[PDB]
Amino acid sequence: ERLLDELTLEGVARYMQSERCRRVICLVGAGISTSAGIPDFNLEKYHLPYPEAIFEISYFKKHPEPFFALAKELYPGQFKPTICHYFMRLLKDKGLLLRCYTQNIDTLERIAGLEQEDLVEAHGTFYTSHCVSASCRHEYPLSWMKEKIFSEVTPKCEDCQSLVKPDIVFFGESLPARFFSCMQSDFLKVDLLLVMGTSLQVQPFASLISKAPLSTPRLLINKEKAGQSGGGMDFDSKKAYRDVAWLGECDQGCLALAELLGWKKELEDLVRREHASIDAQS
């Protein structure tokens, strides 16, 4: 029931290069976007009942304007995916990626080249928006929403003038149905979990680590150990057998893993070319 030869990054690499590792699932959080300038959460200017209300569906339903104002204030001057995003892109290109489950709404996975079939955006995204009226549900792309946010015009539907909301899951909202559809099949077939940039404190996303088979190795690349209790993470006990913790910056851990897999030069060229191509079209 032990598939790793040693509980290190090198053991994970050698396992990835073995016949048993055919399907890899990535579970990613805010830590994989911090080096891109996107915050891992002032707000006094918005006059909120409590600072967290800005992220809850109740307050957005009451007053949607503070969210759009804050979206403009935190709107990144550039959408540049990180080394971690392009490592997942390499996993996709080589046929090893089964799915990327993400907690982020910043669309950086799609900009890195991951497609809809590769992604489960568990908390939604800014990539698309919809008119809130159920008899309309008109869809708008990211450029439309960005132009509405920066002109400081509250986004209204061009067909029925109702409010248009980014396709994100506020706190208190139900997760999208694709989450629960994909999790049923994906976590019976998964051979490896790559948990990157999340401290596993948001539910039901965190519980995903207990859906994998008990023999499936799980590598945590995070600034802190997390997921320790239940099918929780066990990095340090005498009964540890499958969980590996690499503590540090996510970009650094992905660089080390890619080098151990022989992908250092390719990942370098990919990241540099894409960052330059984004700086050009900026």
Binding site: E173, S174, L175
Partner: peptide, 8 residues
């Protein structure tokens, strides 16, 4: 009842 909700 509804699908499980995002909770911190």
């Amino acid at each position: 009842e509804a699908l499980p909700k995002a909770t911190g």
